mmCIF file of C-alpha atoms and ligand atoms in Angstrom:
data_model
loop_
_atom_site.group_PDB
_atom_site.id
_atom_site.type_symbol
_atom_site.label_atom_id
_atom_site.label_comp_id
_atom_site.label_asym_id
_atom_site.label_seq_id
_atom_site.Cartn_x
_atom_site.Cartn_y
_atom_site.Cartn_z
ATOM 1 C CA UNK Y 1 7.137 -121.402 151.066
ATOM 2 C CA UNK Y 2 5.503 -122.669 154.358
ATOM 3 C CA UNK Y 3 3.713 -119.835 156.186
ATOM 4 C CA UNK Y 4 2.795 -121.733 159.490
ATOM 5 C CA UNK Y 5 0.891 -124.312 160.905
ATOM 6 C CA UNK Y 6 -2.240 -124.990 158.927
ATOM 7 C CA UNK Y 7 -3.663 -127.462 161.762
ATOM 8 C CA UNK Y 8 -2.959 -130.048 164.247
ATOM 9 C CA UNK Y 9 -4.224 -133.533 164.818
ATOM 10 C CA UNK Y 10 -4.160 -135.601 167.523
ATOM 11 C CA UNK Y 11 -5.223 -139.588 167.233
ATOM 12 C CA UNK Y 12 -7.551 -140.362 170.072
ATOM 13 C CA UNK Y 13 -8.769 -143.632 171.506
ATOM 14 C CA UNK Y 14 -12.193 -142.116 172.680
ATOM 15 C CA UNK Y 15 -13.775 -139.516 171.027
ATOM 16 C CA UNK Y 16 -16.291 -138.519 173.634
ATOM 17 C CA UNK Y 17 -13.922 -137.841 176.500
ATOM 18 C CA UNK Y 18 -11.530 -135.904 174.404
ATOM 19 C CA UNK Y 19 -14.276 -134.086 172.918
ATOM 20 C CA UNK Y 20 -15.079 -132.904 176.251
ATOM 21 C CA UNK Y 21 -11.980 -132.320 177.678
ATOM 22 C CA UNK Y 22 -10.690 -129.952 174.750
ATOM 23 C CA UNK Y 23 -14.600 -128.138 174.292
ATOM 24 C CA UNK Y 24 -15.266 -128.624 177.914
ATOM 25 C CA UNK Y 25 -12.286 -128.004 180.215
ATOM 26 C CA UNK Y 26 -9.839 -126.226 178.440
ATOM 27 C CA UNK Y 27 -12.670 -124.238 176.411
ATOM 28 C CA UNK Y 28 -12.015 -124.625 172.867
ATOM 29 C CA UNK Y 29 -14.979 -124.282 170.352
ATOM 30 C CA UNK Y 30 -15.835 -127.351 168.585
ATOM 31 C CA UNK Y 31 -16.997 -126.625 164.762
ATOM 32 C CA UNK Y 32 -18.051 -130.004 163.726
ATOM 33 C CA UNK Y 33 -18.268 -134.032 164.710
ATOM 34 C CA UNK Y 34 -18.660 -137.478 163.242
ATOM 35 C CA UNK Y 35 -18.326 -140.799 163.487
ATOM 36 C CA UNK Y 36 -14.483 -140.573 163.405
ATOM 37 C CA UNK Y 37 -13.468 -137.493 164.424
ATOM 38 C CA UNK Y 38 -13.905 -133.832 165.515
ATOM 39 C CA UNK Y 39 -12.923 -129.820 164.495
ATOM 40 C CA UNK Y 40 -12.363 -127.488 167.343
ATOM 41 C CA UNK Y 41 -10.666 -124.001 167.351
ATOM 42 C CA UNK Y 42 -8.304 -122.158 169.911
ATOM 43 C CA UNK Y 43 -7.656 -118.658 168.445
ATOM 44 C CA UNK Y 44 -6.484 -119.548 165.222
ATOM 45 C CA UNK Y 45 -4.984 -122.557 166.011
ATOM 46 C CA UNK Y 46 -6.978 -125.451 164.040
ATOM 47 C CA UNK Y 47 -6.783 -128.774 166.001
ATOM 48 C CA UNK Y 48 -8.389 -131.902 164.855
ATOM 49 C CA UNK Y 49 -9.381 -135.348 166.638
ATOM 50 C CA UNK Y 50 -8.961 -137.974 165.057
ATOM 51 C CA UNK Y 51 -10.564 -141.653 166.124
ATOM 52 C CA UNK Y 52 -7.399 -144.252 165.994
ATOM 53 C CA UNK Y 53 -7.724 -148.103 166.915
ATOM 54 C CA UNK Y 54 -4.014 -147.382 167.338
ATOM 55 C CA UNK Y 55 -3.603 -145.025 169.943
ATOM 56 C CA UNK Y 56 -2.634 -146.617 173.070
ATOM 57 C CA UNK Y 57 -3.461 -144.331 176.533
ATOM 58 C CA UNK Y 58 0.745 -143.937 177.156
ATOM 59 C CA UNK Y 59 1.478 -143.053 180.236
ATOM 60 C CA UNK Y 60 4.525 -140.074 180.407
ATOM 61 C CA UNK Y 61 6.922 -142.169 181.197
ATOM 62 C CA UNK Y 62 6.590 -144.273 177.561
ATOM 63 C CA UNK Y 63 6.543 -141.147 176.023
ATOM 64 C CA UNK Y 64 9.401 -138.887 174.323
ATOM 65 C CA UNK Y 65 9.557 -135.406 175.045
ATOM 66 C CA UNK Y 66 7.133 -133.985 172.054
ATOM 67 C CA UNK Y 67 4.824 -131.584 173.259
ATOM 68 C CA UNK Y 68 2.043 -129.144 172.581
ATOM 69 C CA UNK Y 69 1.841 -125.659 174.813
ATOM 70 C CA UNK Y 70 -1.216 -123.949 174.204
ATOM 71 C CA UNK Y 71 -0.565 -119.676 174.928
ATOM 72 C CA UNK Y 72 -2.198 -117.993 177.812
ATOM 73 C CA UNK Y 73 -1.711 -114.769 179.542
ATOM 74 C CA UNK Y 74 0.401 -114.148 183.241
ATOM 75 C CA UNK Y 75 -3.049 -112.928 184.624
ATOM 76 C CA UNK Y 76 -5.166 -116.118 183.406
ATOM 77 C CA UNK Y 77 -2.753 -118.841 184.656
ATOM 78 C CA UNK Y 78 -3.040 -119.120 187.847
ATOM 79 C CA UNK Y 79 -6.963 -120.181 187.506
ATOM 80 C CA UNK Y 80 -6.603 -121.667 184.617
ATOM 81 C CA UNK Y 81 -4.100 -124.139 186.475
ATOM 82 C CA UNK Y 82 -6.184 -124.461 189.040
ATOM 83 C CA UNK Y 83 -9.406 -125.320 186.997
ATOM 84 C CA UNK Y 84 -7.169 -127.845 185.599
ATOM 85 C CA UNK Y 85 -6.142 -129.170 189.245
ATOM 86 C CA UNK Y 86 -9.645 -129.591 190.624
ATOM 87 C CA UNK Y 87 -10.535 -132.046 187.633
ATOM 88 C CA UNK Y 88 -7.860 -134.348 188.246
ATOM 89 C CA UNK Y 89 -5.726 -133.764 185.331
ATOM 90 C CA UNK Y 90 -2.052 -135.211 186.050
ATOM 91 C CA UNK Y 91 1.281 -133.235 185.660
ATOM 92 C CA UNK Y 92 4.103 -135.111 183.587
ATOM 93 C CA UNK Y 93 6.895 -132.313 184.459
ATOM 94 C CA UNK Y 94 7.257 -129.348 187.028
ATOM 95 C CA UNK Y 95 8.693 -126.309 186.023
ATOM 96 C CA UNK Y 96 12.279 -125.334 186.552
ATOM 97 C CA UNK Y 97 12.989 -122.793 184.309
ATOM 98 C CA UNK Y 98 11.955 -118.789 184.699
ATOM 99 C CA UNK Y 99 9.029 -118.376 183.133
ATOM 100 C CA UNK Y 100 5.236 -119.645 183.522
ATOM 101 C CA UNK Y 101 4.518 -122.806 182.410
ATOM 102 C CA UNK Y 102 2.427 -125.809 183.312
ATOM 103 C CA UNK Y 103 2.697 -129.277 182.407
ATOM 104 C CA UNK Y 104 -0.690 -131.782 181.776
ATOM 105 C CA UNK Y 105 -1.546 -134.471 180.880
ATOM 106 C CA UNK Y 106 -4.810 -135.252 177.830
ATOM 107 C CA UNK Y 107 -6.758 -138.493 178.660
ATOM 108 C CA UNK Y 108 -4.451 -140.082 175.938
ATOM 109 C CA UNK Y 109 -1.456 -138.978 177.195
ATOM 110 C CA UNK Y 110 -0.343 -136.449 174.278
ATOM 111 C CA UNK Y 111 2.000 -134.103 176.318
ATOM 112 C CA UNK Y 112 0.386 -130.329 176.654
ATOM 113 C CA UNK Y 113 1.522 -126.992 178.462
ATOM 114 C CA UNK Y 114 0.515 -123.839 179.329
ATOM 115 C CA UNK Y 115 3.074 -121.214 179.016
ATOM 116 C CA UNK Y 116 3.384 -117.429 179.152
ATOM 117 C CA UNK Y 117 5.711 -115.669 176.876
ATOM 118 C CA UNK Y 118 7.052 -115.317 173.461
ATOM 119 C CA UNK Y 119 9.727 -116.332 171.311
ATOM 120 C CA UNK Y 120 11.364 -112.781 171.048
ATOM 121 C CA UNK Y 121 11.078 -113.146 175.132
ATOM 122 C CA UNK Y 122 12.692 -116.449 175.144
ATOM 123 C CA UNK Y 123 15.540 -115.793 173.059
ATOM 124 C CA UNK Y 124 15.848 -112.292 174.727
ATOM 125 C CA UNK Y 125 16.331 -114.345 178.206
ATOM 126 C CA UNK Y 126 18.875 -116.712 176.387
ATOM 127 C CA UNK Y 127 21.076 -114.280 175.142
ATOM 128 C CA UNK Y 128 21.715 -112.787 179.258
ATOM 129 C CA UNK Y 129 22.044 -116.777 180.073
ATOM 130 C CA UNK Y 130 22.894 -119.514 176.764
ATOM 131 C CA UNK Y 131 22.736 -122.444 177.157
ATOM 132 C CA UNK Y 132 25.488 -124.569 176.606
ATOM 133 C CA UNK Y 133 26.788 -124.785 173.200
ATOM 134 C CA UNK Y 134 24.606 -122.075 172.282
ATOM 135 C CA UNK Y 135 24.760 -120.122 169.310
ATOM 136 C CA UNK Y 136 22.564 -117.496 167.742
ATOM 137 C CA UNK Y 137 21.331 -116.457 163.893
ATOM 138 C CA UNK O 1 -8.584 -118.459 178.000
ATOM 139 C CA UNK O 2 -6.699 -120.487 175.809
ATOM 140 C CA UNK O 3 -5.614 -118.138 172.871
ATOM 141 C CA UNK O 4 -3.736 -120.207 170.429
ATOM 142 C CA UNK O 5 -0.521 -122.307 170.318
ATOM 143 C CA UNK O 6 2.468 -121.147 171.970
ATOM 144 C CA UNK O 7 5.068 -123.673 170.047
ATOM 145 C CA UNK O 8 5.086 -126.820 169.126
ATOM 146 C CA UNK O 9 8.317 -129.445 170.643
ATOM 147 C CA UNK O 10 9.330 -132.283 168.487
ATOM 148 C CA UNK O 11 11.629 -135.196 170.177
ATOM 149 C CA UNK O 12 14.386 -135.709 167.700
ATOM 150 C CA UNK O 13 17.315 -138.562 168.018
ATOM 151 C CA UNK O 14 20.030 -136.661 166.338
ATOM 152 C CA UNK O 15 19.908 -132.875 166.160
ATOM 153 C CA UNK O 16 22.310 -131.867 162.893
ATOM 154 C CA UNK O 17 19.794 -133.731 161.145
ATOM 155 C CA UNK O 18 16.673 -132.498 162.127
ATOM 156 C CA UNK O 19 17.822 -129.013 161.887
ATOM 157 C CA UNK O 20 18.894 -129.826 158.618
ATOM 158 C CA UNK O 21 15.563 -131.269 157.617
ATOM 159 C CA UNK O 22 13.110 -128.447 159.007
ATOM 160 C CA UNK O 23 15.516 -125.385 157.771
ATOM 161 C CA UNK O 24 17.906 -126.579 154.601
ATOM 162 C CA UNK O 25 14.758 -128.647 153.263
ATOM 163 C CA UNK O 26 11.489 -127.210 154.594
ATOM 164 C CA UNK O 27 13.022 -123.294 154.606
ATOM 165 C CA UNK O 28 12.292 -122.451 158.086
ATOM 166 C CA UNK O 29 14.077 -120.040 159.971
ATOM 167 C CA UNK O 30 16.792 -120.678 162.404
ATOM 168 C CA UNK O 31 16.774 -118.917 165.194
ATOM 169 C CA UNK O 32 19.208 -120.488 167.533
ATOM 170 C CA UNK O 33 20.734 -123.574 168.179
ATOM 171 C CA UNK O 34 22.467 -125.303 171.041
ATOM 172 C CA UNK O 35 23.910 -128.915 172.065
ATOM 173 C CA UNK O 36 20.598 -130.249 172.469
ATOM 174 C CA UNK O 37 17.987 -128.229 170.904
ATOM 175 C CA UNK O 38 17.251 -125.327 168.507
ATOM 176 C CA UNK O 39 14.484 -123.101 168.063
ATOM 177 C CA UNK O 40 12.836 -122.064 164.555
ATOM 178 C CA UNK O 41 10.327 -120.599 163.601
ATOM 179 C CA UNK O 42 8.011 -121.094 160.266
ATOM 180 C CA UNK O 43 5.533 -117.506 159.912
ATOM 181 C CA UNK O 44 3.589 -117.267 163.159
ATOM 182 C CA UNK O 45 4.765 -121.088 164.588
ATOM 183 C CA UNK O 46 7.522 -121.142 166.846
ATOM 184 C CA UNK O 47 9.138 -124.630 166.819
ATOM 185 C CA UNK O 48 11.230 -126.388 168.922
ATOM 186 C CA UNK O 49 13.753 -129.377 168.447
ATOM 187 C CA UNK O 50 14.923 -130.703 171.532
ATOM 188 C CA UNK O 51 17.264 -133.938 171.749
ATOM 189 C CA UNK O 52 16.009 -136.973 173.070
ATOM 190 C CA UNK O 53 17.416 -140.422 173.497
ATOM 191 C CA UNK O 54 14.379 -141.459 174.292
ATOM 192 C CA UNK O 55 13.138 -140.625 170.528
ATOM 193 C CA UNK O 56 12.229 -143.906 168.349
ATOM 194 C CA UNK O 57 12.046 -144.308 164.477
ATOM 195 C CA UNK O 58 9.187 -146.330 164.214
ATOM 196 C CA UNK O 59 7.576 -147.083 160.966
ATOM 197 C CA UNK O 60 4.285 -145.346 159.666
ATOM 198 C CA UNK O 61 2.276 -148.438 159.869
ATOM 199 C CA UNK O 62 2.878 -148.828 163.355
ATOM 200 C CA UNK O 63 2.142 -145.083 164.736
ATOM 201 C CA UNK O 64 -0.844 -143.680 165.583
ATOM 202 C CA UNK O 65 -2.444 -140.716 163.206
ATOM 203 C CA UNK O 66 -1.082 -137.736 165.135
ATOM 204 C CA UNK O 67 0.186 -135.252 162.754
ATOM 205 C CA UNK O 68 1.530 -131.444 161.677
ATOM 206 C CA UNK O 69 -0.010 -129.567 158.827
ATOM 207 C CA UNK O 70 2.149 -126.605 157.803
ATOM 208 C CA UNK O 71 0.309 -123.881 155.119
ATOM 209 C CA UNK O 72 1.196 -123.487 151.820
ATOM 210 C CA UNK O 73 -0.206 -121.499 148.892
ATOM 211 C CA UNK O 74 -2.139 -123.393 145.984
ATOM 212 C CA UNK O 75 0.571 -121.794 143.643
ATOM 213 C CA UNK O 76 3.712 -123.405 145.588
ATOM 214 C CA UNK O 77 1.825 -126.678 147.025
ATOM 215 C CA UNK O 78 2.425 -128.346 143.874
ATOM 216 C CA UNK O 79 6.354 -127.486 143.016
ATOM 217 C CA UNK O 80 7.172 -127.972 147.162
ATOM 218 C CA UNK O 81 5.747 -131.438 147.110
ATOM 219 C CA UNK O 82 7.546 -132.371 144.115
ATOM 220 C CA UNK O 83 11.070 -131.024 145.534
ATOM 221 C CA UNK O 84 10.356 -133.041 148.784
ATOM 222 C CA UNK O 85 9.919 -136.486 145.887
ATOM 223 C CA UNK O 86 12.932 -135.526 144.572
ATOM 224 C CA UNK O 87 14.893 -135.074 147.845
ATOM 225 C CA UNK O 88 14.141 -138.848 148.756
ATOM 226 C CA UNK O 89 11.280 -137.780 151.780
ATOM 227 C CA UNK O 90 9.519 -140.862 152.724
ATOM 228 C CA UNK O 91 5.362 -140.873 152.431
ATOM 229 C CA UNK O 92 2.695 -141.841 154.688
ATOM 230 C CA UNK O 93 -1.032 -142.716 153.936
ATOM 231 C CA UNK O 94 -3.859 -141.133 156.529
ATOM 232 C CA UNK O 95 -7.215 -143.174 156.481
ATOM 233 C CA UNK O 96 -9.752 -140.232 155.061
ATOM 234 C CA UNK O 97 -9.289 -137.215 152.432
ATOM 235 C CA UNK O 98 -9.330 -134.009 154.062
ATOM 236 C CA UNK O 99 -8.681 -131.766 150.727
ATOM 237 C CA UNK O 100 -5.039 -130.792 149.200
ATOM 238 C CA UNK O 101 -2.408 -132.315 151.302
ATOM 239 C CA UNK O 102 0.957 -134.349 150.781
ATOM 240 C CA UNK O 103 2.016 -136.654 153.524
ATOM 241 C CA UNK O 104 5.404 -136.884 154.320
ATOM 242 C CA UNK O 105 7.880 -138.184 157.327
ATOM 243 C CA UNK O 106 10.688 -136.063 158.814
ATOM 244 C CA UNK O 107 13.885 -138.451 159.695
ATOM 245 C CA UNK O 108 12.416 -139.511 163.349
ATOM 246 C CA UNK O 109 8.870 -140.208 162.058
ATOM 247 C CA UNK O 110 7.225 -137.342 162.860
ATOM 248 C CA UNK O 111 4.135 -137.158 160.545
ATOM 249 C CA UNK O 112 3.783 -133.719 158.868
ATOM 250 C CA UNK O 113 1.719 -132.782 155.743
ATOM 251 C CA UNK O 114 1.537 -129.710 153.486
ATOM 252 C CA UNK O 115 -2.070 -128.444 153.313
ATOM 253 C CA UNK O 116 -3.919 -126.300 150.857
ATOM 254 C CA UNK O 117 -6.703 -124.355 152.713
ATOM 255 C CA UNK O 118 -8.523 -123.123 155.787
ATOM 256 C CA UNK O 119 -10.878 -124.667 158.291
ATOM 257 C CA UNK O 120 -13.465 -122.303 157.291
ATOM 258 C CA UNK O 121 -12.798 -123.673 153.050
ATOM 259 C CA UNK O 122 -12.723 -127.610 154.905
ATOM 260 C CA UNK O 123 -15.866 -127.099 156.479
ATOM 261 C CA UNK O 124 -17.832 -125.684 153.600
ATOM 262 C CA UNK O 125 -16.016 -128.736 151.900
ATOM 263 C CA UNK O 126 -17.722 -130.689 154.397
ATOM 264 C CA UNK O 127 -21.282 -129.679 153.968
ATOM 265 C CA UNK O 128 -21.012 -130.929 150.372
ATOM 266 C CA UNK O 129 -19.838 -134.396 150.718
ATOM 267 C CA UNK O 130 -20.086 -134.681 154.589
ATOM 268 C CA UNK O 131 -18.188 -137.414 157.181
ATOM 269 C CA UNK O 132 -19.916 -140.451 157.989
ATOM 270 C CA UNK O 133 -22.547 -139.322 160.929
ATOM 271 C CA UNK O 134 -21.595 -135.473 160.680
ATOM 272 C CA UNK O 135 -22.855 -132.461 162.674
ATOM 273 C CA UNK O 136 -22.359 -128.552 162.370
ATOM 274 C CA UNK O 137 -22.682 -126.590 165.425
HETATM 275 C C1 VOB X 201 27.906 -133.089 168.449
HETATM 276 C C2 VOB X 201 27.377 -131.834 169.071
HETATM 277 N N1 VOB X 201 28.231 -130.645 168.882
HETATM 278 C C3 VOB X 201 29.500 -130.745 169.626
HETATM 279 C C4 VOB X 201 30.283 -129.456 169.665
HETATM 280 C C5 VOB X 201 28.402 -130.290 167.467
HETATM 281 C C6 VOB X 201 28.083 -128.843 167.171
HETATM 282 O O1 VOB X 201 28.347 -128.606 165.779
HETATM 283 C C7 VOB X 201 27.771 -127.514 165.177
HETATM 284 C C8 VOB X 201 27.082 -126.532 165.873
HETATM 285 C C9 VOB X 201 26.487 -125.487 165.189
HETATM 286 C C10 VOB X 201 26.595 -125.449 163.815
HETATM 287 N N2 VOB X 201 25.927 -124.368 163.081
HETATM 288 O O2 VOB X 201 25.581 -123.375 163.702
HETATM 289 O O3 VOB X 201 25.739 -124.514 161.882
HETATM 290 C C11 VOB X 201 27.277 -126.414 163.104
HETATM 291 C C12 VOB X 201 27.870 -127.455 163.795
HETATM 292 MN MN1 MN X 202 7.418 -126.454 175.950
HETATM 293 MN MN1 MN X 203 -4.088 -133.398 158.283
#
């Protein structure tokens, strides 16, 4: 039986400015580096780097919807959004739903968010409002 | 402050599918689906399917190394990755060893793996048969 994500890797075209954006900016701790690759923590999410003569920098647009939303509390997103602002990091989406959540881009262009809330609360606000078709277990 | 990961969105092309895949095959738990998305959830992950046109199948050999490492237990890894086999799940090769894993494809290409381990166990791995050009901090 699978009891959750064991970690999470990303391929990266340039280790040193992902390095800093996910250590620097956004504040995770970084664990180890070498020629190929990095370990950095977020709570007790495990995220690796990984070096790739493959990855292209994709803009949003030549992208699919697959995304990675990092948690944060209501109190800690407004500055957090803002920190994120003042360095130039690009939005791929605005929000339309209720709920907090913000939409950035990595110097790659994997697809990231910020968001507020749970999956209890989420399926709590879906039940007053379905979506179409929608149909709970 | 970043405190984790909130959930994780996968692009899929066809939804039956998918949610097929991640809860008949992998055992997740279905939460709720709708016409063009469903949420599950797998321990502490909370994981999202949403439909995407946009979504391509492209081959292994022609994606980049991003990739989804769920846990399992050294008692089940072995029996798991032997029922994915027989089920027909396609394989995919990653460049370096990073312990007890099994690479395998969903049915858009999404690259997960089942892992044996923690990042604390992969780092002291580390220190005994280190990366090419590898630091600790
Ligand atoms: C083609 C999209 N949809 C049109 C109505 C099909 C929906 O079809 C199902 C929905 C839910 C379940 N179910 O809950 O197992 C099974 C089938
Ligand atoms: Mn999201
Ligand atoms: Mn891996």
């Amino acid at each position: 039986m699978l009891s959750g994500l064991n970690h999470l890797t990303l391929a990266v075209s340039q280790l040193a400015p992902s390095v800093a954006f996910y250590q620097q900016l956004l504040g995770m701790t970084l664990h180890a580096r070498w020629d190929s690759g990095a370990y950095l923590s977020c709570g007790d999410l495990w995220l690796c780097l990984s070096l790739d003569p493959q990855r292209r920098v994709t803009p949003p647009e030549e992208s699919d919807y697959t995304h990675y939303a990092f948690s944060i509390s209501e109190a800690d997103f407004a500055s957090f959004a803002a920190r994120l602002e003042a360095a130039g990091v690009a939005v791929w989406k605005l929000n339309r739903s209720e709920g907090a959540s913000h939409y950035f881009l990595d110097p790659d262009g994997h697809k990231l968010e910020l968001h507020v809330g749970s999956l209890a609360q989420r399926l709590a606000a879906c039940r007053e409002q379905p979506y179409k078709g929608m149909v709970f277990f």
